[PDB]
Write an enzyme that holds these catalytic residues in place. Structure first.
Site: not given
Ligand SMILES: Nc1nc2c(ncn2[C@@H]2O[C@H](COP(=O)(O)OP(=O)(O)O)[C@@H](O)[C@H]2O)c(=O)[nH]1
Ligand code: ALF
Ligand SMILES: [Mg+2]
Lengths: 317, 111
Positions: A11, A16, A146, A168, A172
């Site tokens: 997360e 994103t 998400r 990517d 977790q």
């Molecule tokens: N407000 C805001 N939301 C974000 C930002 N970056 C990610 N998100 C949101 O946080 C959630 C997690 O993003 P995600 O890319 O799935 O996290 P990941 O698990 O690292 O790939 C998603 O709903 C995104 O839209 C940010 O800089 N600002």
């Molecule tokens: F969706 Al993730 F790390 F929580 F890419």
């Molecule tokens: Mg992700």
């Protein structure tokens, strides 16, 4: 050709950023591609309002009005109604009334105590637009979605005469054992941190602070012998959420030694230093740090342009 | 023709067709997330069985393969009796549905 890893705890906003690469350096999302996210917006919106309502039961927060109890029931009755991508006006009304309720809002303010999507308030405050039969999600809607990533996903794009192979990954704990599969010959790593996680706890362990988890992870990646010759970029992401949060919630929750003031500028500076101090080889290596809002295309475009110029610099030497 | 059309409608349809499951396994292998479907199929097996002794060993076995922090095929879940893995099976189902299954339908394997 450039091999780019997106790493970070879950997360933190890796996926994103991947979407932003499509927006900026491919062709944006088409209308049809946006239509495919409609179901995901509705699921995200429903699961968010449900998470809040279950939290009320645990935390023992009453509804502002008794009639909402019936709205709560009806929410769960209709919860699967949107899986073919249609929010009925009945369901829209239920969600509206629940979200307006003072009790629900009091629980939302306590989100820190449970697990809730960051985009919850974004969709819920925009329910009228989202509700329409004709609704087509906007690029911002898609960026806000998400969807937990599992595995390793490869992507291609071109920028300034360079072919980017981008990876990517899931963040977790369980997913991390798989990272070793794409560690060979890595040109650059973008490591994402959720700035707004400073007072949250892990989805996989409700006792561990998310930031501390992220630091431990960065410590491991940053100093790894696979990446001695890799340009290491740090994205302190979610700066927008961090800005609203630091007024309400002290940084001492995370760093109890912090003596500075709870203000965007000082708090952000302190976090940056905490991460950069985990670099063991300061004589050799350098961390390129940028404060990002991953969901903001103009911001990500500027930041990535700078990152690309760094990569170009470091592949003449 | 008909077989491919039915896999596109839902993950349920894909996971009920054993040929669908084979092609999907092959896709997950490429993305290093095959543990998800394997864990799901394991839970569907577990549900069916009635023998208390055959159930207790398999429950241990599912836990050691998929759920343990030391487990090699640990599944990404938001951390005896037949339906004891429901919550977890549903979670992995939804993980696949919105993420890897979504990409599966855009893949060459499918088209
Ligand atoms: N407000 C805001 N939301 C974000 C930002 N970056 C990610 N998100 C949101 O946080 C959630 C997690 O993003 P995600 O890319 O799935 O996290 P990941 O698990 O690292 O790939 C998603 O709903 C995104 O839209 C940010 O800089 N600002
Ligand atoms: F969706 Al993730 F790390 F929580 F890419
Ligand atoms: Mg992700």
């Amino acid at each position: 050709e450039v091999k780019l890893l997106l790493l970070g705890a879950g997360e933190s906003g890796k996926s994103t950023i991947v979407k932003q690469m499509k927006i900026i350096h491919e062709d944006g999302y088409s209308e049809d591609e946006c239509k495919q996210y409609k179901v995901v917006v509705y699921s995200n919106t429903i699961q968010s309002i449900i998470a809040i309502i279950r939290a009320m039961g645990r935390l023992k927060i009453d509804f502002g009005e008794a009639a909402r109890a019936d709205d709560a029931r009806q929410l769960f009755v209709l919860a699967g109604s949107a899986e073919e991508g249609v929010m009925t006006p009945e369901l829209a009304g239920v969600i509206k009334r629940l979200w307006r309720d003072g009790g629900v809002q009091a629980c939302f303010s306590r989100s820190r105590e449970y697990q809730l999507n960051d985009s919850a308030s974004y969709y819920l405050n925009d329910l009228d637009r989202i509700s329409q039969s004709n609704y087509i999600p906007t690029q911002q809607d898609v960026l806000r979605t998400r969807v937990k990533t599992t595995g390793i996903v490869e992507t291609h794009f071109t920028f300034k005469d360079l072919y980017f192979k981008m990876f990517d990954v899931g963040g977790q704990r369980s997913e991390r054992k798989k990272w070793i599969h794409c560690f060979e010959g890595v040109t650059a790593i973008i490591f994402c941190v959720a700035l707004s996680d400073y007072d949250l706890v892990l989805a996989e362990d409700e006792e561990m602070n998310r930031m501390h988890e992220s630091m431990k992870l960065f410590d491991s990646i940053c100093n790894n012998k696979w990446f001695t010759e890799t340009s290491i970029i740090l994205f302190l992401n979610k700066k927008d959420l961090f800005e609203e949060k630091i007024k309400r919630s002290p940084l001492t929750i995370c760093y109890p030694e912090y003596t500075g003031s709870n203000t965007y500028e000082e708090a952000a500076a302190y976090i940056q230093c905490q991460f950069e101090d985990l670099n063991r080889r300061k004589d050799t290596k350098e961390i390129y740090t940028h404060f990002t809002c991953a969901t903001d295309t103009k911001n990500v475009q500027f930041v990535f342009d700078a990152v690309t110029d760094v990569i170009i610099k470091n592949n003449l030497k | 023709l008909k077989s491919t059309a039915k896999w596109a409608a839902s993950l349920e349809n894909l996971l009920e067709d054993p040929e669908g499951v084979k092609r999907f396994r092959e896709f997950l292998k490429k993305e290093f997330s095959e543990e998800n479907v394997l864990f799901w199929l394991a839970c569907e097996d577990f549900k069916k069985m009635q023998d208390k002794t055959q159930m207790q060993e398999k429950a241990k076995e599912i836990y050691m393969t998929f759920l343990s922090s030391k487990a090699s095929s640990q599944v990404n879940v938001e951390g005896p009796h037949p339906l004891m893995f429901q919550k977890l099976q549903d979670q992995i189902f939804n993980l696949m549905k919105y993420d890897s299954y979504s990409r599966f339908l855009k893949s060459d394997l499918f088209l």
